[PDB]
């Protein structure tokens, strides 16, 4: 009845599997999850250069989703790359996982702490806090100091580091909830919530619920003004397939 | 399967009916709506004095809801009176309608305009924008300059004034969506959305979807720190029934 | 000549005595202090639930004060519960102790540190800093980690903890003054100011001086717009005695 | 018993008379007002260049006041020139009239409007709003578009323009109080308050009450850190008389 | 001696010519301007979708510039697309034209007004104001309500509309300078500055001077932390040529 | 061809020499540096009192510079004393060294750390961060805890303390660049940049490049509104020589 395209903005199939599993686990009856990733791009997003590439990969999948007539989209990287670009191209609502996780956090706690993977991505999360208006609601931001793909390397080291950092955050930061800062951390939320007795929030699952909510409310992206469909123009070279509508 | 207590913070049964109808219209399969209002309080909330009274009325119903073992609560007045107080008392999540409407607005538009009823309540909405962190996302705030209960007087004047103000807001404000600033405007959202071809958002319906989402995510109010259950103490006089837990 | 109603929002007579003593100690010649507390409510305010109850208790006393024809009111809890509600109901000015202490602090120092009692009340103080616009003027917020009523238990432990925390704040925070974050700390200000050679500010005494100042200036709460007397309506049950005017 | 030096930062004796009259009118029993102005400087302050000159003139009088052993000081220009410099040099508290008027405004209204004299001084008032943290509390800023000294030219034109602008501000701005943006407007506050039935606030009178309040509280400028007495050094030329202490 | 790559992020050669002419007109002796545009992309940037495409086009040229060993780069669209991504990839400094124009404006005026082309791009300029921290320095933002490429259509209509809007801005906004909000407006700055007797600032010319300044200071992008070279990884498909270093 | 007056706001000839050397080292071909200091004032600026004195000393030199017909001015103290006053008096652009250093820092790094000399001057730097709008771009502010003139005492202790503090800042703060917080640190920038492999920015050299840039762009201070020449009036006593124009 409801079809939601969950887009992993990086090209890692391993991370797409983790994201897809988290999305399906919370999906309402009648909801089909279409877990996808770009055909071309970057295996993991670890900075501004990676984000710019990922943004176009998102748009390629948004185009595919709109052609399929999906009800909504999820951008499944914690930088929410190409969010507003995607909202212009898509008819159905587009929700970022950082956006969704932060939104949910303010509903269950006064302040939250972010636990992400790489230190150099903290600035990206800081920018999003300011952009979304949740800076005052964020007590602290932390990184476990590992490459993004360490969450998929099977060692369990990244997962243990997340757990330890969450425990330390709840003791030190003066926050009531944890926002997981990675699509690769998606399947950790439930176990950490049960273990630590506080909301540990995965943006993937949260974004799925936001799309479902908006669809049930009969609400989609405003095509009045800022997020209207892109102005009609000829796209050249590698970009010519992005807007056939 | 899921029971959500939707609390009208004012004592108007007429407004409770409007709020209850909007909540049931969007409720997911398996969701039961318990539309309630305080036994004692104020017929409509039109200022800070009214809000303080309404806040205690909310708590009385929160207590009743928790005794019944409901899955979540909705505070159905645009000032979200007693929101954090309710989150302390309740186990299940508590979502305000102003909170929910503003949250939804940022997901479908870059900026939104608020249309409320009385001018003196604009300051309350301004304070909430700052508190929730959506001040930059709000292009303008407007009032139709009628008493709150004019929405329930059967004349249709308030409803027409809302429509006209929404049209003018979309032309002048530089916004892409409308946030309805009253529980009494709840049943107007769908018709105005279809008519104006932009998201016109009712917080009542939005808050219901937020509660459903949080319950499906296995998330509830953090009892770690700020929103923990109230400290054990003896309440005197009229307040003695508020915390029997 | 000038009568000021100093309202302890909690029901502790012990704290009312401390607050009353601090108010009378600085009162100008011709000023009578009416130290009161609600007939029904909470013994101490330690969270949002407690604040909501205290707010209505304040209003009950505001009503009594206005009937007596007092020149002004003081809300003597560091959360300033029901401040704007009280300003609507009262004719004479209403000053919160957090408000007054913060206002005074900016007049004698570039930045101040707050020392309150319970950790879970720090968020309430943070919210007030943002609401009043003094966030940039506050270097740090601290709690001594004891129940509010520990200040009245006769052990002197809370008083010693305040002193030690003030010393540590002045060494570490980069602030020039201390704002005491409790009505129960009211009588500590003078001794700590003399001992530490910096302004240690009690909001109770400060608020009394603000009321006296406004009365001498011939200024009272604006009844134009936002803080006008509450709209005429029937209050039901426990609330029916709040607005007989 | 209490001696307060009220410093007009400009060299206009006419404005010093207006400022002195406003200060004495509200002074508590036992308070002596010492109305002064710099021996050298600028007849009126109408920009940043004028402010820089006025700041040094303030310091010259602060030095004189401290030599006389006055209990406190008032800086009686709406730009509060040399406020922090004065607080370093003086032992007793130093209160600016813009500072005091804005502080009082937030105690009697949710939002205020500023009415000053020259348009080019609006930016100075804007900067002070941000510095003091009252930007959100200011609904609008207006200028009557006349030279500062027009208030002293005997025509009554400036006074009528202030009145008309206050009436228009209360109708349009969505504010509950007026802050007078000139030391030359000081004696207009009472009449406008009575006429318009809202708080029309003069910073001169307000600052006097703030000094009296701080003295009665046993509070003075913190000499710990930022506002400590200036570091011991040799001042050359025209400045050699500024710090003989 | 100094080679600066000035990148037009859109594919319009006409706009590249305008941008190149403005860059060469102010270039210091010894400075060579390399005016370029992407081989693939969008003819004009008129929204978030266009920006995402332009960002990758910028990166393609950044790669080419770094291979050539240029001293610095300029991103010549008013949305500064891919600015931080470019700073990661490039060794020499990368300056956006919106960034440079806003920076220059604060050095010659207290507040500035922005005049851009399309209304839907105003939100992009608003976001940059917040990101760069110049929101308080911007009095107003305006659009002439024409397509971006109207500046290159030879009619002179867009140019006249810019002039008229600048005149109206200086009369109404309370600003002292104009920031031109288009790379297509680059060659209008000098004539408008001379005509209106105020700074009318072109970001293209300003950014060139910023690059020259940084090179002369011996300063380049920090490779410590956030703007370090992208993490070593395999780029697939259309993106494989972006990082051969 | 281009003459830039670089004003040391303090009276230390030793610091004037350091400032002058840094300015000449980066000056473009054809640029003459006029390194000056006030005839009367303070040997070093270490607080608000010192700043007020320095501001008038700056104006005395601005007057001299304008009489000589210089192309621009630099205010060479990290508090940028009398910046807006100087912009009113001068025809050519006036750039502060704190202003210039902060501006440059945002062009080469996401966030910067400030290293100044005396702790009591940190508040002045904090105020400038807010005024210029770079608060979010500043990760931390540090002082080496020595008198300002320790940089000129020949011991090399201050220079070593700056180096050590820069190393610690880059390890702890999460910043990519260092802003030197003293005119006395001007000649340290190049060596520290080469040693630490990050941008270590001197405001003196940066401000010189900003003046050169503005002159080449044909841009000067706006005389429309806020920064117009001071209103024509008689200056008395020591101030009578400040505005002979
Ligand atoms: O994973 C991270 O830490 C951040 C972001 N990067 C990415 O490839 N997926 C993400 O969610
Ligand atoms: O209705 C309004 O305008 C505001 C708020 N007052 C109220 O009684 N219900 C509400 O939603
Ligand atoms: O005391 C505190 O710490 C905070 C606040 N609670 C209270 O009962 N009185 C108060 O002033
Ligand atoms: O008067 C004004 O408008 C502003 C300010 N200038 C001055 O000479 N005295 C003042 O209060
Ligand atoms: O031109 C504009 O209005 C904005 C931006 N778009 C673009 O194609 N070049 C620009 O500078
Ligand atoms: O030097 C400092 O630390 C700050 C400031 N004071 C001064 O005399 N020159 C300056 O740059």
UniProtKB/TrEMBL annotation, chains A, B, C, D, E, F:
Pfam families: Asp_Glu_race
Taxonomy, superkingdom: Bacteria
Entry's EC annotation: 5.1.99.5
Catalytic reactions on record: D-5-isobutylhydantoin = L-5-isobutylhydantoin; D-5-benzylhydantoin = L-5-benzylhydantoin; a D-5-monosubstituted hydantoin = a L-5-monosubstituted hydantoin
Molecular function GO terms recorded: amino-acid racemase activity; hydantoin racemase activity
Family: Belongs to the HyuE racemase family.
Protein name stated in the entry: Hydantoin racemase
Species per Swiss-Prot/TrEMBL record: Klebsiella pneumoniae subsp. pneumoniae (strain ATCC 700721 / MGH 78578)
